Every structure is written in C-alpha cells, then in structure tokens.
C-alpha cells in the first residue's frame, strides 16, 4: 500500500478538533504532507513531543484529522518504543498462532535471535515472562514479532532501545533494509544514518513539518541544518541537539 498525507491537521481533544473541521487549543500535528510508495521507507525524526508517535496513531485511526486527507488502505503492524513480552514461548511471542517456517527463520536471523534461542535446552520452546530477558533481547523479540506479522504497513516507533551502537546498525541493515525491502514501512528515529538510507524523510518540530523529502534534498535545501560522531551520541543527547537546531531554524 501507498501512504499519503495532504494538509493534515489533528487535535487530540475531540472538541477542539470538531471546531477546526467546522471552521475550515494547540494541534498535535499541523499541515502534514508526505507520500510513500509501496515498498518504500519513510524515516520520521524530531524533537520530543513533536508528534512522531501521534502521526503513527493517526495512521492507525487512533487520531482523526480535522482538515486534510490521509490515504491508506491495508493491515498495520505496529512496533512500539516500549517492548512487551507475552508469558509464553519465544516462538509464540514472535508468530502468535500463524506458523510459516521460512518466514520465521528469516525473521529470527535478521533480528539476531538465533544465538539467543540456542542458549536454552527447549530452544524456541523456552517459556518467557519464567525466563527473564535483557532490554536488548526484549527489544529484538518485539521487533521480530512486528516484522513477522503479515501486514501491509509496518510502523516502527524507535524499536532499537537498549541495543548497543553496533547491534542497532546490523539489525537496521538486516531487518529494516534487507528483509523488509519490499514492505511499506515508517521508522521513527534520531539516527542520521537511517535518514540517509531512507527513501523519504520527515522532520517534525512542535507539530510542524520542518522538512519532507530525501536526504539529498536535505543536503540541497538545508546545508546549515546538516552541518559522523552524531549517531555515537546517546538517545537523550541526539534528541537535545536535534531539538535546539530545530528551534534556531
Ligand atoms: N492519546 C493521547 N491523548 C491526548 N494527548 C496525547 C496522546 N498521545 C500523545 N499526546 C500528547 O501529544 C503530544 C505529542 O506526543 P507524541 O507522543 O506524539 O510525541 P513524540 O514526538 O512521539 O514524543 P517522544 O519524542 O517523547 O516520543 C504530547 O503533548 C502528548 O502528551
Ligand atoms: Mg514517541
């Protein structure tokens, strides 16, 4: 499926949203414009509270526009920024109930879970919730769950938490870039590497679109904004550097 937003403005409060819709307090998102083709990657970046998760919620019909149009048709797979583990086996946590051996093995390889599974006698029959897992292991199982699901659009809201720099790089490449090459997907990130590899980018600030386009277009239109070691900074630091640059401009 292709996902399109045209002049989208939305309010979390239902009452103020109805007022703006009729007319045409603060919008969580305003005048949002993007278009993603089938099999493309959109990277979403921005300051804290810019409306990144809210944009995903709007795509999932949790938040409705007051003006403008959202065009999308398809099943959505959502990977939240906070991992969750069902009391059950690793396999069930990833597949649910629908099993597909080739899809399953592809996903666990791409999320580097083979080494984790081999650690136990029961293998992927090991019961979680029970066995306790590290942040990074929980993150990777959640991502594998989201990616395994048969869906038409994959929404990945900062799914690489508690993973080290090197692991996040390998999995972004193996999962998001390779395995999911033909899937329509939206990634929320503050990693300059991911914006670079994306087909389109959207940079948000206080509900407003700072920039929509390619990373090359970001080089063309925003040279002072563009101006190696950035992705080495922590999530918190990367956020406050991006925040300040968006405030200045
Ligand atoms: N379900 C909701 N109902 C009402 N307000 C909400 C809801 N979800 C988020 N908000 C508000 O909308 C604003 C933007 O939140 P959102 O989570 O979309 O930002 P974000 O960019 O994803 O933040 P972060 O960078 O911390 O993940 C915040 O003021 C938040 O409190
Ligand atoms: Mg968020």
UniProtKB/Swiss-Prot annotation:
Effect of mutating residue 228 to V: In CF; decrease in bicarbonate transport; no effect chloride channel activity
Tissue and organ distribution: Expressed in the respiratory airway, including bronchial epithelium, and in the female reproductive tract, including oviduct (at protein level). Detected in pancreatic intercalated ducts in the exocrine tissue, on epithelial cells in intralobular striated ducts in sublingual salivary glands, on apical membranes of crypt cells throughout the small and large intestine, and on the reabsorptive duct in eccrine sweat glands. Detected on the equatorial segment of the sperm head (at protein level). Detected in nasal and bronchial superficial epithelium.
Mutagenesis or variant effect for residue 134 to I: In CF; impaired maturation of glycan chains
Residues modified as Phosphoserine: 134, 240
Domain ABC transporter: 25-227
Reported impact of residue 134 to R: In CF; impaired maturation of glycan chains
Listed result of changing residue 144 to T: In CF; impaired maturation of glycan chains
Outcome following mutation: residue 198 to T: In CF; impaired maturation of glycan chains
Post-translational modification as stated in the protein's UniProt record: N-glycosylated.
UniProt effect for mutating residue 207 to D: In CBAVD; decreased channel activity; has no effect on glycan maturation
Effect after changing residue 203 to T: In CF; impaired maturation of glycan chains
Result after altering residue 52 to M: Impaired maturation of glycan chains indicating impaired trafficking from the endoplasmic reticulum to the cell membrane
Documented effect of changing residue 141 to V: In CBAVD; uncertain significance
Impact reported for residue 186 to F: In CF; impaired maturation of glycan chains
Residue positions of covalent lipid attachment, annotated as S-palmitoyl cysteine: 111
Subunit comment: Monomer; does not require oligomerization for channel activity. May form oligomers in the membrane. Interacts with SLC26A3, SLC26A6 and SHANK2. Interacts with NHERF1 and MYO6. Interacts (via C-terminus) with GOPC (via PDZ domain); this promotes CFTR internalization and thereby decreases channel activity. Interacts with SLC4A7 through NHERF1. Found in a complex with MYO5B and RAB11A. Interacts with ANO1. Interacts with SLC26A8. Interacts with AHCYL1; the interaction increases CFTR activity. Interacts with CSE1L.
Domain remarks: Binds and hydrolyzes ATP via the two cytoplasmic ABC transporter nucleotide-binding domains. The two ATP-binding domains interact with each other, forming a head-to-tail dimer. Normal ATPase activity requires interaction between the two domains. The first ABC transporter nucleotide-binding domain has no ATPase activity by itself.
UniProt disease annotation: Cystic fibrosis: A common generalized disorder of the exocrine glands which impairs clearance of secretions in a variety of organs. It is characterized by the triad of chronic bronchopulmonary disease (with recurrent respiratory infections), pancreatic insufficiency (which leads to malabsorption and growth retardation) and elevated sweat electrolytes. It is the most common genetic disease in Caucasians, with a prevalence of about 1 in 2'000 live births. Inheritance is autosomal recessive. Congenital bilateral absence of the vas deferens: An autosomal recessive disease characterized by vas deferens aplasia resulting in azoospermia and male infertility. CBAVD may occur in isolation or as a manifestation of cystic fibrosis.
Protein name, UniProt field: Cystic fibrosis transmembrane conductance regulator
Organism per entry: Homo sapiens (Human)
Residue window of the full protein shown: 390 to 669 of 1480
């Amino acid at each position: 499926t292709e996902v399109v937003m045209e002049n989208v403005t939305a309010f979390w409060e239902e009452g103020f949203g109805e007022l703006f819709e009729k007319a045409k307090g603060t919008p969580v998102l305003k005048d949002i414009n993007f278009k993603i083709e089938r099999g493309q990657l959109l990277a979403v970046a921005g300051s804290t509270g810019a409306g990144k998760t809210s944009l995903l919620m709007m795509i999932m019909g949790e938040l409705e526009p007051s003006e403008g149009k959202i065009k999308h048709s398809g099943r959505i797979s959502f990977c939240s920024q906070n991992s969750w583990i069902m009391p059950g086996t690793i396999k069930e946590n990833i597949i649910g109930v629908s099993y597909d051996e080739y899809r399953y093995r592809s996903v666990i390889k791409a999320c580097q879970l083979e080494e984790d599974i081999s650690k136990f006698a029961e293998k992927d029959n090991i019961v979680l919730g029970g066995i306790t897992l590290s942040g990074g292991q929980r993150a990777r199982i959640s991502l594998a769950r989201a990616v395994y699901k048969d869906a038409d659009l994959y929404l990945l809201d900062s799914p690489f938490g508690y993973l080290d720099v090197l692991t996040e790089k390998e999995i972004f490449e193996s999962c998001v870039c390779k395995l999911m090459a033909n899937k329509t997907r939206i990634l929320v990130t503050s990693k300059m590497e991911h914006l670079k590899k994306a087909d389109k980018i959207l940079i948000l600030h206080e509900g407003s679109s700072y920039f929509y386009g390619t990373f090359s277009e970001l080089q063309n239109l925003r040279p002072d904004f563009s101006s190696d070691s950035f992705d080495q900074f922590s999530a918190e630091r990367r956020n406050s550097i991006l925040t300040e640059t968006l405030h200045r401009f």
